[PDB]
Design a protein around this ligand. Structure first.
Ligand SMILES: CNC(=O)c1cc(C(=O)NC2CC2)cn(Cc2ccccc2)c1=O
Length: 127
């Protein structure tokens, strides 16, 4: 069994910004989801070897996880809030694509996604 390389968190070719919206995505949105009792399956790339999911990266071609998002936010990888919001939505969508409805992992993704939506509902206007 083999895991792919993780999504990149570093790319000096990619233009970067520190916006008040991206500051909110780290300080409020990522912080809120990270501390949740159901965060742990999403805090790092899916380990398809240790979890015995040999088909995971046959089905999920755009992997994303909060470990990667945390590194991207801390290392100012993003140009805008939409890039980071897309990463969160990719993470939730991957969970629903791969897993069965009502599986524990899907209930955990649903709980985190509800909090995500409550926090980005109050994403501040750009300064
Ligand atoms: C993003 N994570 C996953 O998609 C994932 C998939 C499966 C899994 O076995 N999925 C098969 C398709 C049912 C198992 N775990 C561990 C786990 C963690 C928490 C509760 C139950 C299981 C995961 O984290």
């Amino acid at each position: 069994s083999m895991n792919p390389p993780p999504p990149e968190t570093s790319n000096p070719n990619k233009p970067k910004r520190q916006t008040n919206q991206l500051q909110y995505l780290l300080r409020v949105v990522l912080k809120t989801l990270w501390k949740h009792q159901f965060a742990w399956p999403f805090q790092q790339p899916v380990d398809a070897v240790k979890l015995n999911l040999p088909d995971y990266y046959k089905i999920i071609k755009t992997p994303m996880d909060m470990g990667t998002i945390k590194k991207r936010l801390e290392n100012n990888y993003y140009w805008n809030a939409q890039e980071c919001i897309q990463d969160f939505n990719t993470m939730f969508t991957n969970c629903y694509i791969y897993n069965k409805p009502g599986d524990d992992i899907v209930l955990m993704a649903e709980a985190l996604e509800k909090l995500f939506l409550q926090k980005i509902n109050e994403l501040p206007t750009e300064e």
